[PDB]
Write an enzyme that holds these catalytic residues in place. Structure first.
Site: not given
Ligand code: HEM
Ligand SMILES: Cc1ccnc(CCc2cccc([C@@H](N)Cc3cc(C)cc(N)n3)c2)c1
Ligand code: HEM
Ligand SMILES: Cc1ccnc(CCc2cccc([C@@H](N)Cc3cc(C)cc(N)n3)c2)c1
Ligand SMILES: C[C@H](O)[C@H](O)[C@H]1CNc2nc(N)[nH]c(=O)c2N1
Ligand SMILES: C[C@H](O)[C@H](O)[C@H]1CNc2nc(N)[nH]c(=O)c2N1
Ligand SMILES: [Zn+2]
Lengths: 411, 407
Positions: A108, A111, A280, A285
């Site tokens: 993420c 963070r 957000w 994305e």
């Molecule tokens: C504040 C606004 C936020 C932005 C811009 C942000 C940005 C991102 C982006 C760009 C990704 C990669 C996801 C993708 O490309 O599919 C991501 C993944 C992730 N985010 Fe954040 N995020 C935000 C808030 C949060 C919040 C509130 C949480 C949890 C409380 C969180 C937990 C995660 C997790 C668990 C993953 C990846 C899951 C995994 O594959 O292990 N995000 N986030």
């Molecule tokens: C196995 C697998 C295959 C394809 N995609 C995935 C990822 C699913 C996912 C988890 C967290 C964030 C997002 C992001 N695409 C959506 C998101 C969520 C939040 C909280 C913030 C933010 N800026 N964007 C997507 C997993």
């Protein structure tokens, strides 16, 4: 043992001692790196150590390690486990848990925001109608008329794994996908399988290109049920371009609130299988992945056609060009409508500062480079040049299998 | 033990068995992944000799043949006696082609089997090295129709008699730190540029001065040589529809030829083995031009395009980045110099993986390096799971010689 990470742009070298407190495993070995692999029942036995450890961390952050209140809480969780096999987290611990699970999310880039997270305790919830209510409130609160706020809603923990609370949707708000007889898709290809499940559960599909899917909710291991989020609660943004007036004629929009609802939240050994969270969007994305992946809306061709780029040879970089415009358009639409969004330059710079701060004060920041680097313009963002250590800390967000694969149907 | 990789764009799933033949180590553990860190005796030598010869004779369908066995005894005797051994030409060629085949960071490996190998083990002097190098440069340039090649100098002996090309590429631009505090030319090469000046090179002090070659034979002090300019093919950079682009002053050289790496075959160490192919567009347009720490031209290019540089959110860097890269491709193609764009190179590498899974049982690949540094997710390697592991023969990094050489 200490570990060094260099930033190859700035020469800044940081030192990790936090990887030492790492418990879970990576997938890698001395002989193989699984760093780009996408996806790499709990008795008393193993439960108390995980509880103790979580509670040790918790009491440290509040500067009361070894306090009477610390000891008494250990002794109380112990007794509760052996008596009832599981245990309840206090409110404070649930809050601290959720925050840290976000904090520990090495994939993420968002963070820096980890400590500002609204936590809604839905552990008193017992029914899907109950769940729907909680979720509507989550959506309204987090949306806040465009000025998005981070929030997570936490439903009851797993017990015997036969009574799970689950949100079947992978995000609370997401667009239908429909497979047509001719092989083409209408709407979002990513959600075809789930769309089918919904239609099968009795959903009347509008069958348009951007239909907000219904919530499909499972309480207490029961068969899940359908609910339409009230449309007034679902903020959407029509996508236009600041200079291309034909852009709006592409018919595109997106929803404002990204909210993941399929992950599992692990805190002190406890498993919260329904813990929808939201923040957000980072522009890319929607603009790179959602619109331009070949397996999603795949608009590249149509945007390049409209711009009349030389599409006859890939070396004209007509794809890159369209991709930038689409992304310019997404950011411009959101900012214009006063819906929170972050561009990828700003997000990555912020994340580098966060990461540095986390080394200074915490002794490390686990980070997954494969995911942190943006899917366009990778090397002009400062993370590309940042070495990262990836390792797994608890609390944590984990993937779990899709519920329709594992669920035992009551009928 | 048998491992699956998945393409998330196409759902193609490949099974990897090749990694089990992995000898070297990754830097990772079960506890911590290091996938994004830039750089992780007679008794030792004979096992290494055997592994190699076993795979060699296998490839030529002669595993467990007399020819195989006798070679092994022959080498065994030479080790026992000389403490090293010499590769046959055939093994040398096979060795090199395979060091490239195993380069897990190289997107360009579809080509691995077509490498021209120049065996320079008979070289004894820097002048000789210079001669071999010019021949390599000319042969590889081929009036713009580039051809892969590697030139191999004599192997390590006692690590006191090393052959080394001190340049990191055979052709690179000079870097000069200035009274301003900023840099003229290529910042990547500033230190090596001091070493050249502090060795005797009259530096023209331009933006794009071809560095001299600095060659060390047999552990001797290294020597300056200027590559005949007629042998350095260069491309002036212009844009297919931006007249003013040419006034930005940009050129780049046609021949990418890495010279600082160490080639390891069957335990033998070739510390001087410069190799070359041809450029992927992005190497020059994204990295060399736009890295903050390289020519860093994004500021100026965006100005000339009159884009709004007031907020990061206009994506003006991105917009300029594309144009810059369009111009590199366009200039090279116009001047008929070989170059591949990142779309086409990655597509080819997918085909190559498919082949390697089908023919060899896998293909070590480092995702962090394979995915181009612009437009990542719109190229197919982005969606491709890759297993990274180290196989031998290989290219390895080595300390910069100025830190090591004794004068
Ligand atoms: C504040 C606004 C936020 C932005 C811009 C942000 C940005 C991102 C982006 C760009 C990704 C990669 C996801 C993708 O490309 O599919 C991501 C993944 C992730 N985010 Fe954040 N995020 C935000 C808030 C949060 C919040 C509130 C949480 C949890 C409380 C969180 C937990 C995660 C997790 C668990 C993953 C990846 C899951 C995994 O594959 O292990 N995000 N986030
Ligand atoms: C196995 C697998 C295959 C394809 N995609 C995935 C990822 C699913 C996912 C988890 C967290 C964030 C997002 C992001 N695409 C959506 C998101 C969520 C939040 C909280 C913030 C933010 N800026 N964007 C997507 C997993
Ligand atoms: C045929 C034209 C070729 C193309 C387009 C090509 C492409 C690339 C690219 C894009 C990289 C990433 C490096 C960077 O970003 O600086 C790379 C790395 C590499 N390539 Fe290839 N390559 C080609 C030929 C070769 C040849 C002939 C060899 C050896 C014979 C080779 C061996 C390597 C090695 C050893 C690395 C990375 C070194 C490391 O960091 O471990 N390349 N190549
Ligand atoms: C510390 C450090 C930082 C950055 N890079 C390095 C390694 C240098 C390097 C190695 C292989 C290929 C290239 C490429 N940049 C140059 C190149 C070479 C060849 C043969 C083909 C091609 N298309 N491009 C450069 C080390
Ligand atoms: C195969 C590969 O690991 C997969 O495509 C990953 C790569 N990096 C990513 N990075 C982000 N932020 N989101 C993703 O979905 C992916 N996908
Ligand atoms: C920190 C990170 O490992 C470093 O920036 C790497 C990432 N990926 C790369 N990929 C390529 N092709 N070339 C590089 O120099 C790098 N640099
Ligand atoms: Zn790893």
């Amino acid at each position: 043992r200490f570990l060094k990470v260099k930033n190859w742009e700035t020469d800044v070298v940081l030192t990790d001692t936090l990887h030492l407190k790492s418990t879970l495993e990576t997938g890698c070995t001395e002989h193989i790196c699984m760093g780009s692999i996408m996806l790499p029942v709990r008795t008393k036995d193993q439960l108390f150590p995980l509880a103790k450890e979580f509670l040790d961390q918790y009491y440290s952050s509040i500067k009361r390690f070894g306090s009477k209140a610390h000891m008494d809480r250990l002794e109380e969780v112990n007794k509760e486990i052996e008596s009832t096999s599981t245990y309840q987290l206090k409110d404070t611990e649930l809050i601290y848990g959720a925050k840290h699970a976000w904090r520990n999310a090495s994939r993420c880039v968002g963070r820096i925001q980890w400590s500002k997270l609204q936590v809604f305790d839905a552990r008193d919830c017992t029914t899907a109608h109950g769940m729907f209510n909680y979720i509507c409130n989550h959506v309204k609160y987090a949306t806040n008329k465009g000025n998005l706020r981070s929030a997570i809603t936490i439903f009851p923990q797993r017990t015997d794994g036969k009574h799970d609370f689950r949100v079947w949707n992978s995000q609370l708000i997401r667009y239908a996908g429909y497979k047509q007889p001719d092989g083409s898709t209408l709407g979002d290809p990513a959600n075809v399988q789930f769309t089918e499940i919904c239609i099968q559960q009795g959903w009347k599909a509008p069958r348009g290109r951007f239909d907000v899917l219904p919530l499909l909710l499972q309480a207490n291991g029961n068969d899940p049920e359908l609910f339409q989020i009230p449309p007034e609660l679902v903020l959407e943004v029509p996508i236009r371009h600041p200079k291309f007036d034909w852009f709006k004629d592409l018919g595109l929009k997106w929803y404002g609130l990204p909210a993941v609802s399929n992950m599992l939240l692990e805190i002190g050994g406890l498993e919260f299988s329904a813990c929808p969270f939201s923040g957000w969007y980072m522009g890319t994305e929607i603009g790179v992945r959602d619109y331009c992946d070949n397996s999603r809306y795949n608009i590249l061709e149509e945007v390049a056609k409209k711009m009349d780029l030389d599409m006859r040879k890939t070396s004209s970089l007509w794809k890159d060009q369209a991709l930038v415009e689409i992304n310019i358009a997404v950011l411009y639409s959101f900012q214009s409508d006063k819906v929170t969004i972050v561009d990828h330059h700003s997000a990555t710079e912020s994340f580098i500062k966060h990461m540095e701060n986390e080394y200074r004060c915490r002794g490390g920041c686990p980070a997954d480079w494969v995911w942190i680097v943006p899917p366009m313009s990778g090397s002009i963002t400062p993370v590309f040049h940042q070495e990262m250590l990836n390792y797994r800390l608890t609390p944590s967000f984990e993937y779990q299998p899709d519920p329709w694969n594992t669920h035992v149907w009551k009928g």
